[PDB]
Design a binder for this molecule. Structure first.
Ligand SMILES: Nc1ncnc2c1ncn2[C@@H]1O[C@H](COP(=O)(O)OP(=O)(O)O)[C@@H](O)[C@H]1O
Ligand SMILES: Nc1ncnc2c1ncn2[C@@H]1O[C@H](COP(=O)(O)OP(=O)(O)O)[C@@H](O)[C@H]1O
Ligand SMILES: [Mg+2]
Lengths: 305, 277
């Protein structure tokens, strides 16, 4: 399903920049800025990368296993997934070095912009679907953590998925997790039952409504809050997700194709929820794919590059 | 506004601070000499100075504690911003390390006995009107048959939760929390005002009873959000999948009961544990 000329080019152009270093260590890097994840300057090679540091205190034998699990990132490469350069360990922090995306994450762009219009969100949907399809078909891996903060953009205009769960040991080796007020976990996952890419599809749908309407949609806003646009415990939210009807887009301001698309993503029964192949054939994405939108221009003009 | 060390019944002349014993969310815990002793240095700025006065009276409460199954609280000195809690030093290793040691058999009888010791100590603390608020295997020490409870009460003054709109969960914490507490958790919830109770402590012991036989925490597979929802609505594992009998599974069924009033007191629980084969 996937092929193109200019897309083939930049992968290899990346794979030329790939070999421009062989090994990485802390002093190779000079802190450029804070995005914990840092924009860094590499000195052995002129590439500017994003280096993420995860603070972990564990014995060497586990660390070497961790590195072998992360090495898989050198194998997965896609135009819809952020490229990986390498992962090293140093002084109590694991570094993950990857492609720097000049637009940041979709949560922080959404923070800057008021709402993201439907036509961009169509191209975002295609990229997420095809990225997730790649991992299923080529690597037998689910993402496990789709949300706006893990979809990155740049000024060239590519949008790619990051932070998925390649290493079971790294997940477990982390001492402490951070659960806040927004949750993108699917209902089936919250109840501890079997799950598949369907849970990633739920996460994409909920993310799309949030960005389209400008607010995390659980709990739904009241009548008067939807007009203005145009204190809840964590367990209350999670039980809302499991038991109340899923969020839906307002029916005035969005196309039927877009509303049906998110609706199919947010079906609570994962057997009835759309799968990756059905999304590929939905009217909304086929329509979106055949559209002339300067995504770079939209991004740069709203953010300021 | 201050707590001196001559307030205490343990005569104290000098105090040597040695090496760090381990990393921990609440203060630092150093080796010390008084006999050798364990010193926990914590820092509080001074804000909420009415909380330190309340802390002071709860500490003086600790002064009246002495029990073979409860670590010996020996003293506390407070010179704000610096606090120190000095307890006896526990030889051995923590129960968390013991049950995760492949080279150590934990027969059903041994687990019955370890549980019974913890129950005795917690029954004592309850009788004195003291809630532990953080019962777990890392806060129990086992040295060839000697079982001691540690760090009771600290959780109130602890501040281990502190990102913006995002609460910090440590790996083992959630599965020790009774549903009453789990349903309360929020990104600006604080330990000082969480609904801890004698029943919540019994729930935490229930978690330890699972851990003794599985040799791992419940909900090991699952992420934090899944654990919050499943435990909030009352879903709980059993031990049949490793072939444990009805008698020692009813223990969990009682201790983990969703309605607080169905959980036994520690004295009744001691009875129940006496009657296993
Ligand atoms: N490759 C990257 N390029 C640009 N920004 C990044 C990159 N990776 C992470 N970030 C930044 O890191 C932040 C996200 O934190 P992260 O460690 O990814 O966890 P989470 O995504 O769960 O918040 C966002 O502000 C995002 O802009
Ligand atoms: N009485 C004691 N004897 C020996 N070690 C102790 C004692 N009290 C605490 N420690 C150690 O100090 C460290 C800090 O423990 P604690 O403050 O209980 O944090 P945690 O509960 O997360 O381990 C732990 O490694 C623990 O084993
Ligand atoms: Mg402790």
């Amino acid at each position: 399903l996937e092929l193109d000329e200019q897309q083939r080019k930049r992968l290899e152009a990346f794979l030329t920049q790939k070999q421009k270093v062989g090994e990485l260590k802390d002093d190779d890097f000079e802190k450029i800025s804070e995005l914990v994840v840092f924009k860094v300057s590499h000195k052995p090679s002129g590439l500017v990368m994003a280096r993420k540091l995860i603070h972990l205190e564990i014995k060497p034998a586990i660390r070497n296993q961790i590195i072998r699990e992360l090495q898989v990132l050198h194998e997965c490469n896609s135009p819809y997934i952020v490229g990986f350069y390498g992962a090293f360990y140093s002084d109590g922090e694991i570094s993950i070095c990857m492609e720097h995306m000049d637009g940041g994450s979709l949560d922080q762009v959404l923070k800057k912009a008021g709402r993201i219009p439907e036509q961009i969100l169509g191209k975002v949907s295609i990229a997420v679907i095809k990225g997730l399809t790649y991992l299923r078909e080529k690597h037998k891996i689910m993402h496990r953590d789709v949300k706006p903060s893990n979809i990155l953009v740049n000024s060239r205009g590519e949008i790619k998925l990051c932070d998925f769960g390649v290493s079971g040991q790294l997940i477990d080796s982390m001492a402490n997790s951070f659960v806040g007020t927004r949750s993108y976990m699917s209902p089936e996952r919250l109840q501890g039952t079997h799950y598949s890419v369907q849970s990633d599809i739920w996460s994409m749908g909920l993310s799309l409504v949030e960005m389209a309407v400008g607010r995390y949609p659980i709990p739904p806003p009241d009548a008067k809050e939807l007009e203005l646009m145009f204190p809840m415990a964590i367990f209350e939210l999670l039980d809302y997700i499991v038991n109340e009807p899923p969020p839906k887009l307002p029916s005035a301001v969005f196309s039927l194709e877009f509303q049906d698309f998110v609706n199919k993503c947010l079906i609570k029964n994962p057997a009835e929820r759309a799968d990756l192949k059905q999304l590929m054939v939905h009217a909304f994405i086929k329509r979106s794919d055949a559209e002339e939108v300067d995504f770079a221009g939209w991004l740069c003009s709203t953010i300021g590059l | 506004t201050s707590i001196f060390l001559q307030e205490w019944d343990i005569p104290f002349e000098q105090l040597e601070i040695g090496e760090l014993i381990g990393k921990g969310r609440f203060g630092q815990v150093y080796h010390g000499r008084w006999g050798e002793v364990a010193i926990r240095l914590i820092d509080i700025e001074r804000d909420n100075e009415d909380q330190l006065k309340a802390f002071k009276r709860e500490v003086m409460a600790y002064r009246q504690t002495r029990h073979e199954n409860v670590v010996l609280f020996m003293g506390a000195c407070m010179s704000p911003p610096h606090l120190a809690i000095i307890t006896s030093l526990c030889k051995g290793r923590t129960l968390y390390s013991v049950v995760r040691d492949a080279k150590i058999v934990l027969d059903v009888n041994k687990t019955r006995q370890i549980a019974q010791e913890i129950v005795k100590g917690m029954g004592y603390l309850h009788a004195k009107g003291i809630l532990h608020k953080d019962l777990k295997s890392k806060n129990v020490f086992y040295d060839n048959g000697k079982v001691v409870i540690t760090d009771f009460g600290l959780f109130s003054i602890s501040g281990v939760l502190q990102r913006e709109d995002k609460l910090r969960i440590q790996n083992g914490w959630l599965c020790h929390l009774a549903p009453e507490i789990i349903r309360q958790l929020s990104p600006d919830t604080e330990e000082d005002k969480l609904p801890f109770s004698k029943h919540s402590d019994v729930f935490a012991l229930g978690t330890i009873w699972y851990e003794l036989h599985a040799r791992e925490w419940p909900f090991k597979t699952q992420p934090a959000e899944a654990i919050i929802w499943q435990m909030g609505t009352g879903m709980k594992p059993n031990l049949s999948q490793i072939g444990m009998g009805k008698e020692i599974s009813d223990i969990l069924l009682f201790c983990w009961a969703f309605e607080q009033e169905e959980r036994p007191t520690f004295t009744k629980l001691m009875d129940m544990l006496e009657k296993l084969p």
